[PDB]
Symmetry: D2
Subunit: 92 residues, 4 copies
Amino acid sequence: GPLKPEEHEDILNKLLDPELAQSERTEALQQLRVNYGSFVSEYNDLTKKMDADLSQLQTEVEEAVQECRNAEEKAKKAITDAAMMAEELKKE
Amino acid sequence: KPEEHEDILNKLLDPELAQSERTEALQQLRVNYGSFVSEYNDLTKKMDADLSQLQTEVEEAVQECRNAEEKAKKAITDAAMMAEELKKE
Amino acid sequence: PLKPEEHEDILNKLLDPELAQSERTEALQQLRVNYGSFVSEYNDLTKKMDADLSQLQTEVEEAVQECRNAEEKAKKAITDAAMMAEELKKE
Amino acid sequence: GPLKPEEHEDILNKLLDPELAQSERTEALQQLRVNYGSFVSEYNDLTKKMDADLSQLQTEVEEAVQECRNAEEKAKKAITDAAMMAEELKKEQ
């Protein structure tokens, strides 16, 4: 997978030799180009996935929030009906 | 009747009381008592039904709190699920 | 409390003009005790129910407040999740 | 690692030169060495913040769960109180 630090350092070390064969130089540069493009791509795939994850969590917690509003509304109806029952008994 | 009920009982104490005036006094206690027992039974029936309805309506709010728990627990499990999903890659 | 049929027997007993004064006074005292106690039971029943309805309102209002506190904690997680997305945009 | 893929490509194209002076070849590889170490640390901190964010959100939502259970039990006791009131009204009869 992605080049580890020590494995990445070995490539940079052999690229330091000016008399390195061109076939080996292009091969090492290709490894850096493929590894850097794959690592950048993986970084953007996690940034996008986390942003969508945080957005999905906000929508799911909001449905629990709205359910708390239903609890307050129904409980307040029992309060209103209890006061209505009190006024109803004093009318008679 | 509040105070006139004692006036009717005081008038019926007279053994001289005319039978027409005695029957009218006893019938006044007859209609008033039947009206009072009905209002009492209507009261004990109304408050028993009122408290039963309040239990049902407050229970509706209890269930909404349960639904809120279930929605929020789903967000907790989903958040934990998208945590192990990030470590898989 | 005196039942409607049992109350009718006392009224029919008082209808008798030949009834002795000892039983007539005792039958009227039977109606005076029954009525004053019946009115007292009715008023005390109304007073107790009004205190019950007022107490239930207070107890449910406190349950509403806990629902509000639960709502504000859940909304805080939404607000914190939103700033977590903005703080990951520090690129 | 703020090096965009086009900036990284120019360094690779520079290292392709066989006649490249040793000082320029050493400097170019030093840029990649520092940039790669800064990009791995940024990747590790990202995976660290993502796990800590999802853990803190679970904790805050669980705090909201415990209060919903508390509000549930408060209202359930009001139901029992309402039932105990109806039982006490019937006892006095």
